[PDB]
Design a protein around this ligand. Structure first.
Ligand SMILES: *[C@@H]1O[C@H](CO)[C@@H](O[C@@H]2O[C@H](CO)[C@@H](O)[C@H](O)[C@H]2NC(C)=O)[C@H](O)[C@H]1NC(C)=O
Lengths: 50, 50, 50, 45
């Protein structure tokens, strides 16, 4: 018996499946998947002081 | 961790007595990202698998 | 503000984010988690209108 | 000089600035006034 234990928290760490990344598109309404975070919106350059 | 979470190897490795996923579907594991994957390996009896 | 804040509630679901439910679970399971969110959202909107 | 304190489960009201930093905090079980501040989610009552 092997138990694969994990947590899904919008990927603070990745360990992602065999998916292929594409190029970024900015200032357009696009669908997106960022390390599993899934949604639709317009992505812009951020000026938030992270 | 720090790896590509390719789960097709589990289905290719062997047929299993049970493959039961609780948090996710067993066929969506290759689309998701996992913060920390832990594999807990142990041997139990059939009457204890449940 | 209350009506928007209720969007973060799980109402018994694994996640308040619909895309996480659809990404992680196959239709027959996703429908259960989604029905839990729909029920909570229905009471939130009905309370707001009342 | 050396100091040691211990953590406990507590609820805090954390005040953030325009930048991603915490400027103040209220310990919600310290004082009736702090509990009120947490209830209202304000540092002014
Ligand atoms: C928040 O961060 C900014 C820098 O990112 C701090 O500095 C101010 O930045 C603005 C940017 O337009 C300048 O116009 C101000 O003059 C800067 N401040 C000073 C004193 O020169 C800003 O101080 C930070 N805020 C806090 C509360 O720490």
């Amino acid at each position: 018996v092997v138990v694969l234990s994990f947590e899904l928290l919008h990927a603070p760490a990745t360990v992602c499946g065999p998916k292929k990344s594409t190029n970024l598109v900015k200032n357009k309404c696009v669908n997106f998947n960022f390390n599993g975070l899934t949604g639709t919106g317009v992505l812009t350059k951020s000026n938030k002081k992270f | 961790s720090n790896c590509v979470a390719d789960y097709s190897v589990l289905y290719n490795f062997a047929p299993f007595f049970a493959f039961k996923c609780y948090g996710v579907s067993p066929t969506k594991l290759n689309d998701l990202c996992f913060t920390n994957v832990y594999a807990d390996s142990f041997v139990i009896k059939g009457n204890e698998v449940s | 503000n209350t009506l928007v804040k209720q969007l973060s509630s799980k109402f018994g679901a694994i996640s308040s984010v619909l895309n996480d439910i659809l990404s992680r679970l196959d239709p027959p399971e996703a429908e259960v988690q989604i029905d839990r969110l729909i029920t909570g959202r229905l009471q939130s909107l009905q309370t707001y209108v009342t | 000089d050396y100091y040691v304190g211990y953590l406990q489960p507590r609820t805090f009201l954390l005040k953030y600035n325009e930048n991603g930093t915490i400027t103040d905090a209220v310990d919600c079980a310290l004082d009736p006034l702090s509990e009120t501040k947490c209830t209202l989610k304000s540092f002014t009552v």
